[PDB]
Scaffold this active site. Sequence first.
Site, PDB file in Angstrom:
ATOM      1  N   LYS A 147     -18.045  18.177 -22.206  1.00 17.45           N
ATOM      2  CA  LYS A 147     -19.374  18.602 -21.733  1.00 17.45           C
ATOM      3  C   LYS A 147     -20.368  17.444 -21.812  1.00 17.45           C
ATOM      4  O   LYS A 147     -21.121  17.215 -20.878  1.00 17.45           O
ATOM      5  CB  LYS A 147     -19.894  19.867 -22.450  1.00 17.45           C
ATOM      6  CG  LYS A 147     -20.102  19.778 -23.946  1.00 17.45           C
ATOM      7  CD  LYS A 147     -21.310  20.595 -24.397  1.00 17.45           C
ATOM      8  CE  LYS A 147     -21.390  20.735 -25.932  1.00 17.45           C
ATOM      9  NZ  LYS A 147     -21.101  19.469 -26.710  1.00 17.45           N
ATOM     10  N   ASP A 179     -21.032  24.127 -21.698  1.00 20.22           N
ATOM     11  CA  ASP A 179     -21.640  24.403 -22.982  1.00 20.22           C
ATOM     12  C   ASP A 179     -21.642  25.918 -23.215  1.00 20.22           C
ATOM     13  O   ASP A 179     -21.255  26.680 -22.320  1.00 20.22           O
ATOM     14  CB  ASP A 179     -23.038  23.792 -23.046  1.00 20.22           C
ATOM     15  CG  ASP A 179     -24.063  24.595 -22.296  1.00 20.22           C
ATOM     16  OD1 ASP A 179     -23.662  25.397 -21.425  1.00 20.22           O
ATOM     17  OD2 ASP A 179     -25.267  24.440 -22.603  1.00 20.22           O
TER      18      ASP A 179
END
Lengths: 245, 239
Positions: A147, A179
């Site tokens: 991420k 996320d």
Amino acid sequence: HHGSRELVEIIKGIGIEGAKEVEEKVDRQFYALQYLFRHQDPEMFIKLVIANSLVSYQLTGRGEDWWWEFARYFSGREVDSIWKAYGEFLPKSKNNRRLIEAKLNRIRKVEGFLSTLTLKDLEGYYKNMKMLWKALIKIMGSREDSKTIVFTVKMFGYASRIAFSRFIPYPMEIPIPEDLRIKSVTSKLTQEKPTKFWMKIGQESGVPPLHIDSLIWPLLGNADLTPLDIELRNKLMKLTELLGL
Amino acid sequence: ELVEIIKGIGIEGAKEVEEKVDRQFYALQYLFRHQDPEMFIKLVIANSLVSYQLTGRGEDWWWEFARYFSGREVDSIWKAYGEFLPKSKNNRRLIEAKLNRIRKVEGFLSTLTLKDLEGYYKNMKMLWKALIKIMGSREDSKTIVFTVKMFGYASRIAFSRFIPYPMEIPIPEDLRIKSVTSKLTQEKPTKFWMKIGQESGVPPLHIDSLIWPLLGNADLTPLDIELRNKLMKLTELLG
């Protein structure tokens, strides 16, 4: 692991051109970068955005507040060592003062890579973003779909479009930043891994997952869509409905 | 008390509000990245001069303008507005008169190079007087003073330099500003706020920038803590 004909259709209806409008007229992190760019050397500005992105996790405040806090701190500031500046910045920050040792270690790692780059090398990375992606996966030793790595590409693209005065679309190959909230919204639709689920949506719609990210986030927050044309606002309301919010 | 707070914020605080929070500035920053510098400034002057008696919110209008001219070749600003206004959402009123005003300013703008504009940025009272002359307006015309204000925005973006607005240019005096001012004084906003400016050292066009975010429940989260605190005291005073 079912796909989504309706998400493909609406995202295709919005288009990269719609995502660009959201990024540049709605996304508050973009506006923070526009401000810093007016108060910083172009090369240093781009590198700071890369370095900042790499430590933008497990914050002690809102993401938008954090990017504004970064923009205020480096505005009018002479930076020699990015690593040394973050050493002073993070501990005294409001919005990012947890895990400072680990984060400083991360900036130390990237600092070498960035020291090798000229402004022309960065313009080169904007013209060829998968190369930057791959070079960040190398120096940081992280997953392709990390991420923080993909978010760093996304933010590098914001900085570059400001600094290099032109729009280049993100590569289809770069996955969405997964996320906790993106996992959460995606899980209402499927148990498929979000990066895989949204890659297929992106491939079928023709809108890269990093541009899809730009469409979703305003809808998860408290966005002002009034800068946008009525037709685009209507499509975003449809997307909102299809995501179950 | 009003004077003291405003003096505390200062021109530098006004500048941060303008550049981080003001929604017109945001719109112009967008348009600047999708136009050539000289056309950008000229479009902003012409737009401002027809930004009265709208059919929507002022901020929506400035975004609609930015969207329309983004990446757009302009051969005649007057011709472009003849196409734009009749199909607009937020400025579909008094189109004949507005097109006539653009015809008038276009003649003046056509004489000007990018360097001439930069000179008007260095002498904004000359631009004010010039626009009053060509447009046939009042010194305290909302539309004329707000045109100098947006020109200032456009110039700050295009030239990457700040020059404060002149102390002489009055506040743009619309119904909203009269509402606010009537809770404070009976004097005419244009006169009262001129005095507030001389005494605080903050030109009235910069004071304008302080009030509207407060009117409109703007997000002050981009701003430094200390500035945001000064603005909250201003909000209380103004009610």
